[PDB]
Amino acid sequence: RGWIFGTTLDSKTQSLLIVNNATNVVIKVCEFQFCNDPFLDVYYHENNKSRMESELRVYSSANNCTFEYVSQPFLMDLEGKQGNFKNLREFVFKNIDG
Amino acid sequence: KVSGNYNYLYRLFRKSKLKPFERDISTEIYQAGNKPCNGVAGFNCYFPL
Numbered sequence: 422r423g424w425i426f427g428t429t430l431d432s433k434t435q436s437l438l439i440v441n442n443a444t445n446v447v448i449k450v451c452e453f454q455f456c457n458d459p460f461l462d463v464y465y466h467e468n469n470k471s472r473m474e475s476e477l478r479v480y481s482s483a484n485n486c487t488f489e490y491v492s493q494p495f496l497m498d499l500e501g502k503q504g505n506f507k508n509l510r511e512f513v514f515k516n517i518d519g
Numbered sequence: 520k521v522s523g524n525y526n527y528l529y530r531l532f533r534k535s536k537l538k539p540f541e542r543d544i545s546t547e548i549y550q551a552g553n554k555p556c557n558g559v560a561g562f563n564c565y566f567p568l
């Protein structure tokens with residue numbers, strides 16, 4: 422569902438927050454102290470029920486966080502009508518001069 | 520302001536040179552001399568800003 426980039430990932434160093442949606446993207450920059458509380462269900466197993474919607478619980482705090490960004494979805498979940506031709510999703514990340 | 524303006528600030532000491540076009544705002548004390556203060560900002564512990 423997404424990726425995190427930053428250093429020390431706390432409310433003391435500027436941090437990124439990149440999450441991918443169904444068809445959206447919510448990239449942002451903040452100083453959130455953390456957001457690692459997904460609240461995994463005791464019955465989170467997908468074999469019984471795969472129901473997991475809006476399981477974000479993100480940006481718990483924001484002291485100095487204003488820079489926000491939204492655009493169209495990046496990952497295009499597509500099906501080849503079978504699991505054998507799995508979508509070999511490939512990404513390359515570099516961060517020269519922004 | 521007839522008493523002067525003090526809302527405009529600048530950082531003084533840092534660990535290394537700044538990369539081109541990269542903000543480095545941070546709230547902590549400078550490690551100078553031989554006393555790495557934990558926020559005491561005593562001797563040899565100068566406020567960066």
Ligand SMILES: *[C@@H]1O[C@H](CO)[C@@H](O)[C@H](O)[C@H]1NC(C)=O
Nearest residue numbers: 441442443444445446447491
């Ligand atoms: C995420 O996608 C759903 C449906 O694709 C949409 O309803 C929701 O608004 C999106 N999230 C945001 C933050 O816009």
Ligand SMILES: *[C@@H]1O[C@H](CO)[C@@H](O)[C@H](O)[C@H]1NC(C)=O
Nearest residue numbers: 464466467468469470471472
């Ligand atoms: C599967 O999940 C449903 C509700 O999500 C629950 O009622 C059921 O007992 C679970 N187990 C089986 C074997 O269906």
Ligand SMILES: *[C@@H]1O[C@H](CO)[C@@H](O)[C@H](O)[C@H]1NC(C)=O
Nearest residue numbers: 452483484485486544545546
């Ligand atoms: C950032 O948020 C804190 C929260 O208390 C506030 O005190 C401060 O003025 C804000 N701005 C800066 C530059 O720290």
